[PDB]
Amino acid sequence: IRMYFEPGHYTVMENCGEFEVRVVRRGDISTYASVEYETQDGTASAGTDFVGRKGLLSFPPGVDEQRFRIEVIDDDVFEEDECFYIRLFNPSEGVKLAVPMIATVMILDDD
Numbered sequence: 001i002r003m004y005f006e007p008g009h010y011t012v013m014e015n016c017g018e019f020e021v022r023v024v025r026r027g028d029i030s031t032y033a034s035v036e037y038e039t040q041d042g043t044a045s046a047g048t049d050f051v052g053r054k055g056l057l058s059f060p061p062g063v064d065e066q067r068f069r070i071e072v073i074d075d076d077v078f079e080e081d082e083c084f085y086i087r088l089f090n091p092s093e094g095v096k097l098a099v100p101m102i103a104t105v106m107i108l109d110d111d
């Protein structure tokens with residue numbers, strides 16, 4: 001069992017409100033599996049550019065992907081391109097992560 005981000009890169013608009021992130025499970029599909037994710041600060045900041053999130057992604061037997069939305073924080077203040085990262089971790093017993101196993105998000109400014 002392998003798990004990774006697909007898409008691994010996300011290009012998002014500051015006005016976009018929310019975007020879906022997607023993690024995929026490959027190999028044996030027949031057993032329950034899970035992986036934890038957590039946003040991580042980059043040149044973009046939790047609290048000011050996006051709202052931080054940590055979670056558990058559960059894959060029941062038979063399901064090979066999980067999606068989750070992340071909220072982008074809009075404002076009226078000019079910036080240039082900025083990144084933050086979502087990272088995977090604590091995969092359940094059978095699981096080994098593959099690349100990408102950290103997703104990259106660029107917030108394109110609009111102001």
Ligand SMILES: [Ca+2]
Binds near residue numbers: 043
């Ligand atoms: Ca910023």
Ligand SMILES: [Ca+2]
Binds near residue numbers: 079
């Ligand atoms: Ca911003």
Ligand SMILES: [Ca+2]
Binds near residue numbers: 014015074110
């Ligand atoms: Ca804006």
Ligand SMILES: [Ca+2]
Binds near residue numbers: 075077
């Ligand atoms: Ca802005």
